[PDB]
Write a protein that binds this ligand. Structure first.
Ligand SMILES: O=c1[nH]c2cc(C(F)(F)F)c(N3CCOCC3)cc2n(CP(=O)(O)O)c1=O
Ligand SMILES: CCCCCCCCCCCCCCCC
Ligand SMILES: CCCCCCCCCC
Ligand SMILES: CCCCCCCCC
Ligand SMILES: CCCCCCCC
Lengths: 47, 101, 98, 51
């Protein structure tokens, strides 16, 4: 796998509500989160 | 700025200004164009094999109109006050009725 | 002498080298051929060994970055709108109700 | 670095001017309240003198 870093205090990556129900990267939601998913889908690598 | 009521003009970046205007109670607005020109970008350790295909994926997403869709969704489709009266009401030169009510 | 000329003069200052302001004989940009599958313009000149650098407003994209490593854009373009200046129209009849 | 996926710039943020709904008696603005009252008191004064 790969280790990916980002900042939290920004409208790009935010902690979605009900984070206790989710776990891992699924809890983090935001514009920058969708960009990371599309790039990982195009390149083809888990992260 | 919200308390000055037309007395304090804060100078910030374009993306943060558009988000604080739309995704917040819109008592302030952005006026004028950008003074300087900057640009964001994802990084990669110096001398790594994850720079070529990553750069090609960024240009592919920006060419297929995907980044413009994601921006219009998180900045406009999810604003706090929304877009009330999206059609900008032109400044009527005629005298209103409330002025002589 | 223009914008790209001054840009190349400033680039050659921070990166000392010998350069000649050559002009492309085709006057076109990077366009993939239908059947020949060969480039043209500045991309065709750089892919076949005709110039050392291209100080020109080349629109970066996916079809050109795979063959020519671009740099950070010095300026951003935009598909803008142009219209005639809003001059005073001819005042028609019933203009006293304004 | 990769190619810039988003462009930005130093922008200006000012308070959005409200609609500024004029008052009900906005037509009494060109003349102060002291003028309107002095006119009424001069109106009744001239009438009594004329009588
Ligand atoms: O890399 C490119 N850079 C370009 C730069 C310019 C400009 F800088 F504005 F001169 C223009 N023009 C805009 C209108 O037509 C006349 C000249 C075209 C360009 N094109 C062709 P396009 O892709 O069809 O737009 C490119 O390919
Ligand atoms: C003596 C009394 C004078 C009263 C003047 C009232 C003027 C109010 C102007 C604004 C009205 C808004 C409803
Ligand atoms: C401004 C409050 C008083 C307005 C008086 C208007 C009088 C009009 C007739 C003289
Ligand atoms: C500015 C021209 C207006 C013409 C209105 C004509 C109405 C006819 C009933
Ligand atoms: C407060 C002013 C009242 C005026 C009433 C009308 C007088 C002619």
């Amino acid at each position: 796998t790969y280790i990916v870093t980002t900042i939290l205090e920004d409208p790009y990556v935010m902690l979605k509500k009900n984070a206790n129900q989710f776990e891992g990267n699924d809890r983090y939601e935001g514009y920058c989160v969708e960009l990371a998913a599309e790039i990982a889908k195009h390149v083809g690598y888990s992260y | 700025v919200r308390k000055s009521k037309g007395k304090y003009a804060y100078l910030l970046e374009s993306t943060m200004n558009e988000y604080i205007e739309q995704r917040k109670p819109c008592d302030t607005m952005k006026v004028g164009g950008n003074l300087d020109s900057k640009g964001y970008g994802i990084a990669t350790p110096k001398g790594s094999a994850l720079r070529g295909p990553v750069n090609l994926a960024v240009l592919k997403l920006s060419e297929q109109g995907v980044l413009d869709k994601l921006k219009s969704k998180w900045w406009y489709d999810k604003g706090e006050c929304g877009s009330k009266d999206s059609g900008s009401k032109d400044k009527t030169s005629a005298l209103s009725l409330s002025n002589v009510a | 002498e223009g914008y790209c000329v001054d840009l190349a003069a400033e680039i050659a200052k921070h990166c000392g080298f010998k350069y000649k302001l050559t002009i492309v004989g085709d006057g076109k940009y990077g366009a993939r051929d239908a059947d020949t599958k060969i480039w043209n313009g500045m991309v065709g000149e750089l892919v076949y060994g005709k110039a050392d650098i291209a100080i020109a407003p080349l629109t970066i994209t996916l079809v050109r970055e795979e063959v020519i490593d671009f740099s950070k854009p010095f300026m951003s373009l935009g598909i803008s709108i142009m219209i005639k200046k809003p001059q005073k129209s001819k005042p028609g009849v019933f203009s006293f109700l304004d | 670095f990769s190619k810039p996926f988003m462009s930005l710039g130093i922008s200006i943020m000012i308070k959005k001017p409200q609609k500024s709904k004029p008052g009900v008696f906005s037509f009494l603005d060109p003349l102060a309240y002291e003028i309107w009252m002095c006119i009424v008191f001069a109106y009744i004064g001239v009438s009594v003198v004329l009588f």
